[PDB]
Structure 1
Amino acid sequence: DQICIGYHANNSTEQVDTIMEKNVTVTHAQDILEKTHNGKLCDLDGVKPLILRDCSVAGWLLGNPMCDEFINVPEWSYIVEKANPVNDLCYPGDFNDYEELKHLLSRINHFEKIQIIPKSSWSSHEASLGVSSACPYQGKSSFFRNVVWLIKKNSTYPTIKRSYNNTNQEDLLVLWGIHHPNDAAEQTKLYQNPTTYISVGTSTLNQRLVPRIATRSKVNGQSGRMEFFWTILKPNDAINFESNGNFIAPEYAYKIVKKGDSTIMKSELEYGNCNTKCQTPMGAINSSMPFHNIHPLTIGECPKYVKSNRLVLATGLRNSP
C-alpha cells in the first residue's frame, strides 16, 4: 500500500513567459490585455460626439456656409475632427491663437449661440454685400455666417463705435476679424480710407489691428486674406470696438453653458450609432481588462494603454506533457 503527493494537470495549452523561460504551458492563465474594438465612433455614456465630418473647428465656429449642419449644435461628449478637413477657412487667412482655442474646447461640453450685434443694426454702413466666391452657398457667393463683412455706403466709411455688455452670467466666446486687401487701390475701393485700424478693448484686452498689404498667391481664387481673433468676455464686462475700415464684425458670439471633460479626437472614421463608456480614435472598448493596446488617446472610463501585444499572467502551475 502507498500514498503519493502530486499536482494538477489538464488539457490546457495556454502559455506564459518568465524571465528564464518562454512559452511555458500552464494549467490556468489570465489575459489582462484588451486587444479588440468595434471599429466605430460612438456615443459616450449616451451623450453623442460632435462629429464635424469634413468641417474644421474654425469652419464650424466662424459659421462657414458649408458647415450648415453645425449651426446651433447640441451638447457633445467629445469632438471628432479629421486630419485635414477640406471645409476649413473658405476665404484664405489665419486663425489667431487657434491651438490655444482648440485647447479651451477640451474643457467645454456645450455652446449656446446668441446674437450680440444685429446685422440690420448697421444703418450707417452696408452689411449685405460682404461676400466672396471663395465661400459659395447654393451657387451664390456667401460668407462666414457668424461675422459681418462691413463695406462703405455711398462712398463713405465713417468710424464705427460699438460696445457690448455681457449681462449673461456666463463666459462668452467672441469672434471677429480684419481684412487684408491686395493693393492700395482695393483698399480705397472697399473702405475708401487709405489708412485704417480696428481697436478692440475689454477689461483685459487692449488691441489695435492694422491691415497689412502684400502681393499674395491666389488661394481658393483669392489673393486677399482674413485674420480672425477671439477673446473670452467675462460676465458683467463690456467689449468695445472702434474702426475706420477693414473690419469684420461679430453678429453672433457663442455662449459657454457647460464645462466638462471633453476632447478633440482626430479620426477619419464616421459614426456607428453605437454606445460605449470608453472611446478611441480607432473604435470603442467594452472590457473588464485592466489594460488595452488599441490607441493611447482615449476618453471615458478606460483600461490603461500599453504597447504590448501580449500580457498573460500565470494563475495555475506548470502543465505537464
Structure 2
Amino acid sequence: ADGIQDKICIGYLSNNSTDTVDTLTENGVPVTSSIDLVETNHTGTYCSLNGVSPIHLGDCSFEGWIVGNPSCASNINIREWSYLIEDPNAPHKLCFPGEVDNNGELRHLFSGVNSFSRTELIPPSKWGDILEGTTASCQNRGANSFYRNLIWLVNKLNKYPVVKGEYNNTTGRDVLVLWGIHHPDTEATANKLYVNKNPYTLVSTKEWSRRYELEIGTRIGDGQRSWMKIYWHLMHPGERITFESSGGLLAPRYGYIIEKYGTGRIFQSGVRLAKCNTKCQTSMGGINTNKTFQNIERNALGDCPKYIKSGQLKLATGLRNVPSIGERGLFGAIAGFIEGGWPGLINGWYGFQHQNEQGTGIAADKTSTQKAINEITTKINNIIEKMNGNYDSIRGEFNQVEKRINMIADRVDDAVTDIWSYNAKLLVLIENDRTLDLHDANVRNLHEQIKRALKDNAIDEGDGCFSILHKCNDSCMETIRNGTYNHEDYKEESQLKRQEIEGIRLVPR
C-alpha cells in the first residue's frame, strides 16, 4: 500500500446509534441519545395523592354519604380526602325518597377537602317538646332510624309547638350545614305528623332568609309516597343561622367544619383502590414521573404533567453521527469501546482519530464535550423546569341539569390541551433540528482550532481530517490534542514535504 502522510481527524466518536428522532425538516434521524418528554406509564389503580387517601364511597352515592344514610359508612372519624371514587349506580342513595338541592355545587366543593371534621351543630333537646320520626326506609342498628345528620321532628302527644334552634359559626373555618323539609303524600299525613295547619319552616342567616311550606302529594320514590327536600349552606366564620318550624323541618344535627375544599375530583368506580402513593391521579391510574407531559388520560388531578393529544416526543440530546455526515464536511468514527466509556447524556464524545506509523486511533476532547454536555443539560432543564404551572384537568362536578356549563368547562379544558399539544410537538421538532446543528457547530469549531494550530504544516482534506506534512508520532499527536503543538517546530520539514508532494504525478508528465 502506498505511503501516506500522518493524519488527524476531528469529529464525533460514538457507537452505532439505534434511536431515531424527528426534526422539523426530517423524519427518522438516528442519534446517539434522546430523552422521552411524554409519560406513558401509570399504576392502573387509584392511589393516595401526595400522601392523602381518597374516600371510596363503595355502595353509596355522594348524597347518601354526605347526608348520613345509615347504610353508608359513618364519616364521624374522617379528617381529610384527596378525591372521591363513586359508583354511578350505587344502590344506597337517599334512603327516604327525596332530593338534595343544588347538589352539583355540593359535589364540587366536597370533591376534595384537606381538613374535615364532623361537628354537632344543635343538640336534639333544643327543639323542645317534640319527638323524633324514624322510618324502616332508613334502618340502623336493627331499628327504624333516619339520616345521621338530621332529626325528623314530629308531634308529641298530638302537639307540635313552634320549634327554634340556632348555630353560630365560631370555628374560624367554614361550616357546612344541612337541613330538610318533609312533604307528606296527603293532608291527613301532614295533620297527623305536624298537627298545625299550613305549617311553615323559616331558615335565616344575617344575609338571607327562606321560608318553606309543605308541598303535598303522592310521589314515586321506592317504598314511600311522600317526599323530602334537602338543603344546605356553607357558613363562613362569624355567620349565624336560625331555624324555626311549626311542622316539616328536618332539623340540622351534625354538620361539617372544612378548610381547603373543592380540591379534588369525583372519579368513577371500577379501577381498583390500592396501597400506593402518587403525585397525579387520573381516571386510568396514578402517575409518578418528572416528565412534564402525559398522553394517558385527560381526566387528571394533582401535581400532574400536562395532558397532551400526542404520541411520544423524543427530544434529541446526542449526536447525529451517521455515515453521510462526510457529505457536509464532517468526520465521525464508530467504536464499540473507549477508555472510560461514553458520557451519559450525549453518548458520547467530540474528539480525534489519528493515524501515524505507530498506528491508530481515537481519543476524546474532554473540554469541548463538557461544554456541550453543559449546553444540552441547560437546554433540557430549561424546557422541563420552566413548566412549573398548574397542569391538571380544568374541571368541575356538575349534576344532570347542568349540561351547558359542564360542556363549556370540558371544552375549555380541551382547548388548553390543544394549545399545549401543538406547542409541545413543534418545540420538540424545532429544538431537535437546533440540537443536532449545535453539535455540528461545536465540532466544526474544534476543527478550526486544530486548523489554526497546524497552519501551513497540514493539508485540509475537507472531510474533517488533516494530512500532516511531517512525521507526527504519538507524542506529536498528543501536542496537537492538548493544544501545545507549535507549527514553527516543523516548518522546515513541512515545507520540504510540501514541495515533494507538489512534484508527484499520477500520470507521469
Query: What's the TM-score, normalizing by structure 2?
Result: 0.57
Partners of 1:267 and 1:12 in 2: CA distance = 45
Q: Which residue of 1 aligns with 2:36?
A: 31
Give the superposition deviation at 1:281: 2.2
Q: Which residue of 2 aligns with 1:289?
A: 291
Partners of 2:261 and 2:186 in 1: CA distance = 46
Indicate yes or no: 2:67 matched with 1:62.
Answer: yes
Q: Which runs of 5+ in 1 are unaligned?
A: none
Single out whichever of 260-269 and 227-236 deviates more from structure 2.
260-269
1:236 to 228, 235, 238: 238
Partners of 1:86 and 1:317 in 2: CA distance = 61
Indicate yes or no: 2:213 matched with 1:227.
Answer: no
Q: Which residue of 2 aligns with 1:90?
A: 95
Single out whichever of 227-236 and 76-85 deviates more from structure 2.
76-85
Write out aligned runs for 1:51-200 (5 A): 51-106=56-111, 108-127=113-132, 130-200=133-203
Q: Is the 8 A contact 1:9 1:320 kept in 2?
A: no
Give the superposition deviation at 1:102: 2.2
Q: Is the 8 A contact 2:54 2:83 kept in 1?
A: yes
Q: Secondary structure at the match of 2:287?
A: coil
Question: Letter of the aligned partner of 2:79 in structure 1?
Answer: P
Distance 1:107-1:205 versus aligned 2 partners, 3 A rule:
farther
Q: Which residue of 1 aligns with 2:267?
A: 266
Give the superposition deviation at 1:91: 1.4
Partners of 2:26 and 2:321 in 1: CA distance = 12
Q: Which residue of 1 aligns with 2:277?
A: 275
Q: Is the 8 A contact 2:108 2:262 kept in 1?
A: no
Q: Is the 8 A contact 2:127 2:164 kept in 1?
A: no
Q: Is the 8 A contact 1:83 1:266 kept in 2?
A: no
Q: Which residue of 1 aligns with 2:310?
A: 308
Distance 1:211-1:320 versus aligned 2 partners, 3 A rule:
farther
Greater RCO structure (CA 8 Å; 6+ sep): 1
Q: Which residue of 2 aligns with 1:204?
A: 207
Q: Secondary structure at the match of 1:73?
A: coil
Hey, which of these two has a bigger chunk of helix by percent? 2
Partners of 1:260 and 1:250 in 2: CA distance = 21
Question: Letter of the aligned partner of 1:309 in structure 2?
Answer: G
Indicate yes or no: 2:250 matched with 1:248.
Answer: yes
Partners of 2:232 and 2:178 in 1: CA distance = 5
Q: Is the 8 A contact 1:50 1:79 kept in 2?
A: yes
Q: Secondary structure at the match of 1:99?
A: helix
Distance 1:234-1:32 versus aligned 2 partners, 3 A rule:
closer
Partners of 1:20 and 1:232 in 2: CA distance = 57
Give the superposition deviation at 1:309: 2.4
Indicate yes or no: 2:54 matched with 1:44.
Answer: no
Write out aligned runs for 1:13-28 (5 A): 13-18=18-23, 21-28=26-33
Partners of 1:260 and 1:230 in 2: CA distance = 16
Give the superposition deviation at 1:200: 0.5
Q: Secondary structure at the match of 1:100?
A: helix
Q: Which runs of 5+ in 2 are unaligned?
A: 325-509
Q: Is the 8 A contact 1:79 1:262 kept in 2?
A: no
Partners of 2:316 and 2:166 in 1: CA distance = 70
Question: Letter of the aligned partner of 1:249 in structure 2?
Answer: A
Single out whichever of 66-75 and 76-85 deviates more from structure 2.
76-85
Partners of 1:192 and 1:270 in 2: CA distance = 51
Partners of 2:322 and 2:40 in 1: CA distance = 26
Identity of aligned residues (%): 44
Give the superposition deviation at 1:149: 0.5
What is the total number of aligned residue pairs between the two structures?
Answer: 317
Deviations 1:143-164 (A, max 9, x none): 1111001111111222212222
Give the superposition deviation at 1:30: 2.1
Distance 1:304-1:295 versus aligned 2 partners, 3 A rule:
same
Distance 1:15-1:176 versus aligned 2 partners, 3 A rule:
same
Q: Secondary structure at the match of 1:36?
A: coil
Segments ≥4 residues shifted beyond 6 Å: none
Question: Letter of the aligned partner of 1:119 in structure 2?
Answer: P
Partners of 2:280 and 2:150 in 1: CA distance = 37
Q: Is the 8 A contact 2:61 2:88 kept in 1?
A: no
Give the superposition deviation at 1:235: 3.0
Q: Secondary structure at the match of 2:178?
A: strand
Distance 1:92-1:320 versus aligned 2 partners, 3 A rule:
farther
Give the superposition deviation at 1:307: 1.9
Give the superposition deviation at 1:266: 0.9
